[PDB]
Design a protein around this ligand. Structure first.
Ligand SMILES: Nc1nc2c(ncn2[C@@H]2O[C@H](COP(=O)(O)OP(=O)(O)O)[C@@H](OP(=O)(O)OP(=O)(O)O)[C@H]2O)c(=O)[nH]1
Lengths: 76, 51, 228, 51, 50, 249, 50, 230
C-alpha cells in the first residue's frame, strides 16, 4: 500500500491517529520484539504496518489487547 | 572508495524511504510534497511533469 | 566485438490469449529496434486464415434488413469478421450455415467439417426470432498474409461478381494487439541498458508465445542471406 | 474527464488514468509532428482595407 | 528575400521538411520546421548548482 | 561564428581589448603559439629605428569567472597584413568576429515530452564533437601561518595518510606540474603543532597494546574540493623575506 | 500543455481521410489499423464499444 | 510463402560514399530492414580510433611547443580525427617524427606494415622554425561506440606517466546512413521492392562488411529472443 493510504483511512477515519497507530506498530516491528503478520515483499516496516492496518488485523484496540496479553504472559 | 556494495545498500535503504521536495516560494500547502525516490545518473533532479 | 545477450525472460500469461513478456538486459537502443521489428513483421505480415466473402440468399445490398433478424446485416458482418477459423490442409473453403428457430445462431451451428476447426465454438453470430427464423448462408474462408480492407477488393474487382457477394475485411494475422514498452534497466553497474515489455493479445488460434516465436523465426530466416 | 473519473470510481483509478493520459498524450503528440512556420500565421486579406 | 535565397539553395521555400521518427521509422504528419539557430551555453552550470 | 549576425560584431570584437590588432601594417615574418613577429612596411617605417613589431600573446590565464582567456594566432607565415587587421582571436572570437556561442540544427516539434516545458533535448552528437565543453581555471591557495604552538611546515610528512596519496608529491610536498588529480587528493602537505591530546582511558589502553606512538602534529593539507577533477596547470610560491625557501621554491 | 495538444490532435475529426465509413469490431482493431498505416489517425468511423 | 534478400550490385561512388542495394524484398520488409540496419550500423560498427598521445616536451594539454602555432590541445583535437586501419593487432603505437618548416600531415607518420592511413592529406600541425622538431607516439586501440577520457580512468592500471595525454575515443567509422525502399519491378512478379542503403563513412569499414556485420548482430539477438524458456 505504498501508493495511497486511502483505504486505511476508510478503516480508521481520523487519518491522524492512523499514522500514530502505524508508528507504534512499526516501531514494535523494527525493534524485533515481534514479527510481521504479512508475507514480506522485501518492504520496510512502514508499508508493512500500513498493509497490516488495511486488512483489519491491527488497530488501537487490537494493539492494546495483544499488548496486555504479552504483558500478562511475561509476568508469569 | 564507493564500490558496488555501497550502491546495493543505498538502493535497499532508499526503497521505501520518502523524501520531501519543496520550492522556495511555498505559496500553499502543495508547495511541499513527498515522493518516492528513484536513483538516477546526473546531477539534476527529475520530477514528474503533471505535478 | 562481443555483445550482451539477454537473460531472465519471464512470461506471465494472464488469460491464455493475453501474454506479457519481459526481457532484459539489452544493449543501448536495441529495445526499440527489436520491439519495432517484431511488431511490424508480426502485425502486417502473418500467414493466417479468415473469412473473406459472404453470400446471403436474401439481401442484395449491405444496408437492407432481413425479416425477423434483429441485428442488421452490418452487425452479422462484424460478428463473422471476428470468427476465428483454423483450417489444416485446404487453403480456401466454402462453409454453409443453415439454422432455424428462436435463439442465437452460434459458431456451433456451422456444418461440422473435417479440415476446418472452429477454435471458439460458442462465438455468437446472429439472433433469430420466432415463427420465421430462417437463416441460410455461405461464408468463404481464405488463407493469406496480413490485413487487407474491403475497399481494395471492391476497387480491384475486375472479376465482376453476382449480387449478394458481401466482402468483409480479412483479418488474417492471428495477433489482435501488440505493443512494446521500453524501460530503464541497469546491470549492477551499467545504467545504459533497457527492458522490453511485450504485451500481446492474439485471437485464440495461435498461443501468443508461439506467435512471437514464429515471427522472430521468419524475420531471422529473411536475414539468413548475410549472417555468416 | 478526470473530474468525473474521480467522482465515480475513486482515487486509485483516477491516479492510474491520469498517468495513462500523460503517456498516451506525449506519444501521440510526438507522432503528430506539430510545429510552427512563418507562413502558418496568415495576415487577413482585408487588413489594409480597414486601415 | 529569404524565399528567394532558399530557392537558390534548392530547398523548400516554406522552410519545413518532413522528418522520419528515428525510433520507429514512420514519417511524421505535417512536415516540421528545421534549420540552424545560434545558441548559447549560459554560466548557470548544473555542476555548481548541485 | 554566428551564421546570422548584425554586422556590429566586428566592431565589438575589435574595440574590446581581447583581440590583438596590427599598429603598422606589413608582412608577418614569424608566427608561433606565443608571439607574432611582423616586419613593417618601409612606407610607414619610422626614420629612426623602426624595426619590426613583436606581439606577445596571452595563454590560458584564469578569468574573473574562472574561464579560459587564451589567444590563438590567426595568420600564417608570409601573409601581408594591413594596419588594423585581426592577428589573434581572443576568447569566443573567430577571424575578428564575435562568436558568443555556436549554431546548432534545431527542429521545432514535441518529442515524447522530454522538451515538455522550456527544457531542451540534445543529441549525443553534440557532446561527441566536444563543441560545448568549457575550460575552467580555478585557483586554490594554501597559506601556512605560525600559531603560538609553533610555525607550520609544508613538508611531505603527513601522519597516517596512505603513501598512494603522497606519491604525486615531490620531496618538497608540492604537486608536480601536470599531474591529474580528483576530489579528495592532497595537493600541498601541511601539518600543525598540537599536543596534550587528553585522550580518554580506553585510548590509552589501545596505545599501550598496539604501540601507538601519538604524533603531535594535526593535518591541514589542502585537498581538492569534492567532485572536481582536472590538471594542475601552474603553481606559485610566495615566501616572506627571512624564512628559508624550500627546494621547490 | 503538451499532453492536451496530443490528445486534441488525437480526437479531432476530419472531412475526408483514409477509411471513411469502415466498420471495426472494436478499439483494438482500430489501433491495429492505425499502426499499420491503413487508416488516418482521425477519420469518421463506426465502431462497436462496450 | 516468402522470398529472401540477396546482395546485388554494390556501387562505390567515392572512397567514403557507398550505395548498397538489396533487390528481392517482399512487400513490407523494406522499411523493417531499412530501420533495423540503420540502427545497428549507427550504433555498433567496430572501428579504430586514437586513444592516447605522448609528446615529449609537453607535460599537460595546455602548454605549448616552441616553433609550432597550434596549441597542444588543438593538436590533440586534430589527432582525434585520424582515420587508421589496423588489420591484425588491436593496439598499435605509431611514431611521428618531423623537423623543419612545413605542414606535418598524417602521411609523415612512420608507415608500419599492418597499419594503413586512409587519408594521408589530413593535416596535423604547421612548423615555423628551421630547427623546430616534434616527436610523438600515438597509441591507437580497437573499440566500438564512444568512450570519453573521463570513463577510461576506471581501467587506469597505474597511469603514473604524466606524459600520457588522453583523448576521447570516437570508436565509430559510420558517419551517415539513409535507406530508400523503391519498387523493383521485375518483369515477372507483382509487388517486390528494392532497398537502397546509402552510407557515408570515414573510409575504414567497407560497405559489404558493415552490412554483413549488422545482419550478424541482429541475427544473434533474434536467436536469443525467439526461444522462450518461461
Ligand atoms: N501511480 C501509478 N501507479 C501504478 C501505475 N501502474 C501500476 N501502479 C501501481 O503501483 C504499484 C506498484 O506495484 P509493483 O511495484 O509493480 O509491485 P512490487 O512493489 O511488488 O514490485 C502497484 O500497486 P500497489 O502498490 O500494489 O497498490 P497497493 O496494493 O500497494 O495498495 C501498481 O498497481 C501507474 O501507472 N501509475
Amino acid at each position: 500500500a505504498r501508493v495511497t493510504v486511502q483505504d486505511a483511512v476508510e478503516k480508521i477515519g481520523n487519518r491522524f491517529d492512523l499514522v500514530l497507530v502505524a508508528a507504534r506498530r512499526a516501531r514494535q516491528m523494527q525493534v524485533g520484539g515481534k514479527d510481521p503478520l504479512v508475507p514480506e515483499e522485501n518492504d520496510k516496516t512502514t508499508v508493512i504496518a500500513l498493509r497490516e492496518i488495511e486488512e483489519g488485523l491491527i488497530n488501537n484496540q487490537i494493539l492494546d489487547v495483544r499488548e496486555r496479553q504479552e504483558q500478562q504472559e511475561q509476568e508469569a | 572508495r564507493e564500490e558496488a556494495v555501497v550502491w546495493d545498500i543505498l538502493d535497499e535503504v532508499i526503497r521505501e524511504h520518502p523524501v520531501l521536495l519543496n520550492r522556495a516560494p511555498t505559496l500553499h500547502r502543495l508547495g511541499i510534497q513527498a515522493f518516492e525516490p528513484v536513483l538516477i545518473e546526473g546531477k539534476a533532479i527529475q520530477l514528474h511533469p503533471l505535478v | 566485438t562481443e555483445f550482451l545477450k539477454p537473460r531472465l525472460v519471464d512470461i506471465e500469461q494472464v488469460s491464455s490469449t493475453h501474454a506479457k513478456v519481459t526481457l532484459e538486459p539489452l544493449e543501448r537502443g536495441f529495445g526499440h529496434t527489436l520491439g519495432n521489428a517484431l511488431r511490424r513483421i508480426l502485425l502486417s505480415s502473418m500467414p493466417g486464415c479468415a473469412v473473406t466473402e459472404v453470400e446471403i440468399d436474401g439481401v442484395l445490398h449491405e444496408y437492407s434488413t432481413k425479416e425477423g433478424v434483429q441485428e442488421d446485416i452490418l452487425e452479422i458482418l462484424l460478428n463473422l469478421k471476428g470468427l476465428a477459423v483454423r483450417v489444416q490442409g485446404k487453403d480456401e473453403v466454402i462453409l454453409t450455415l443453415n439454422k432455424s428457430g428462436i435463439g442465437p445462431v452460434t459458431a456451433a451451428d456451422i456444418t461440422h467439417d473435417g479440415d476446418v476447426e472452429i477454435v471458439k465454438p460458442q462465438h455468437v453470430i446472429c439472433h433469430l426470432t420466432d415463427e420465421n427464423a430462417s437463416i441460410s448462408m455461405r461464408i468463404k474462408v481464405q488463407r493469406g498474409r496480413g490485413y487487407v480492407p474491403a475497399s481494395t477488393r471492391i476497387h480491384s474487382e475486375e472479376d465482376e461478381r453476382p449480387i449478394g457477394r458481401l466482402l468483409v475485411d480479412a483479418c488474417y494475422s492471428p495477433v489482435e494487439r501488440i505493443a512494446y514498452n521500453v524501460e530503464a534497466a541497469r546491470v549492477e553497474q551499467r545504467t545504459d541498458l533497457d527492458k522490453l515489455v511485450i504485451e500481446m493479445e492474439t485471437n485464440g488460434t495461435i498461443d501468443p508465445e508461439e506467435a512471437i516465436r514464429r515471427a522472430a523465426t521468419i524475420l531471422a530466416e529473411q536475414l539468413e542471406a548475410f549472417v555468416d | 474527464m478526470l473530474n468525473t473519473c474521480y467522482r465515480i470510481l475513486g482515487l486509485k483509478p483516477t491516479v492510474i488514468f491520469a498517468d495513462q493520459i500523460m503517456y498516451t498524450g506525449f506519444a501521440y503528440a510526438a507522432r503528430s509532428g506539430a510545429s510552427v512556420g512563418i507562413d502558418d500565421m496568415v495576415i487577413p486579406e482585408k487588413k489594409h482595407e480597414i486601415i | 528575400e529569404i524565399k528567394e535565397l532558399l530557392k537558390l539553395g534548392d530547398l523548400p521555400t516554406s522552410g519545413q521538411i518532413r522528418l522520419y521518427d528515428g525510433r520507429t521509422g514512420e514519417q511524421f504528419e505535417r512536415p516540421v520546421t528545421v534549420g540552424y539557430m545560434y545558441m548559447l551555453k549560459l554560466n548557470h552550470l548544473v555542476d555548481d548548482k548541485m | 561564428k554566428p551564421l546570422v549576425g548584425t554586422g556590429m560584431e566586428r566592431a565589438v570584437a575589435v574595440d574590446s581589448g581581447v583581440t590583438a590588432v596590427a599598429k603598422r601594417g606589413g608582412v608577418v615574418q614569424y608566427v608561433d603559439a606565443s608571439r607574432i613577429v611582423i616586419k613593417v612596411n618601409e612606407d610607414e617605417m619610422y626614420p629612426g629605428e623602426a624595426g619590426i613589431d613583436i606581439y606577445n600573446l596571452t595563454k590560458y590565464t584564469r578569468s574573473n569567472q574562472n574561464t579560459c582567456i587564451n589567444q590563438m594566432p590567426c595568420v600564417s607565415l608570409g601573409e601581408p597584413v594591413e594596419r588594423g587587421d585581426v592577428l589573434a582571436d581572443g576568447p569566443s572570437t573567430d577571424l575578428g568576429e564575435l562568436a558568443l556561442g555556436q549554431n546548432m540544427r534545431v527542429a521545432f516539434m514535441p518529442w515524447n515530452g522530454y522538451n515538455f516545458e522550456d527544457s531542451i533535448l540534445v543529441s549525443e552528437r553534440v557532446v561527441q564533437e566536444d563543441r560545448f565543453t568549457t575550460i575552467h581555471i580555478q585557483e586554490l591557495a594554501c597559506v601556512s601561518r605560525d600559531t603560538k604552538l609553533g610555525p607550520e611546515e609544508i613538508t611531505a610528512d603527513i601522519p597516517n595518510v596512505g603513501e598512494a596519496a603522497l606519491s604525486k608529491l615531490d620531496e618538497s610536498g608540492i604537486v608536480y606540474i601536470g599531474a591529474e588529480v580528483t576530489g579528495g587528493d592532497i595537493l600541498v602537505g601541511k601539518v600543525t603543532p598540537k599536543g596534550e591530546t587528553q585522550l580518554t582511558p580506553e585510548e590509552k589502553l589501545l596505545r599501550a597494546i598496539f604501540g601507538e606512538k601519538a604524533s603531535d602534529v594535526k593535518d591541514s593539507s589542502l585537498r581538492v574540493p569534492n567532485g572536481v577533477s582536472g590538471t594542475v596547470i601552474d603553481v606559485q610560491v610566495f615566501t616572506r623575506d627571512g624564512v628559508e625557501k624550500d627546494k621547490r621554491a | 500543455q503538451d499532453v492536451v495538444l496530443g490528445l486534441y490532435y488525437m480526437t479531432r475529426d476530419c472531412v475526408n481521410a483514409k477509411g471513411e465509413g469502415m466498420v471495426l469490431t472494436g478499439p483494438k482493431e482500430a489501433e491495429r489499423l492505425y499502426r499499420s498505416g491503413l487508416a488516418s489517425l482521425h477519420a469518421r468511423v463506426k465502431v462497436r464499444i462496450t
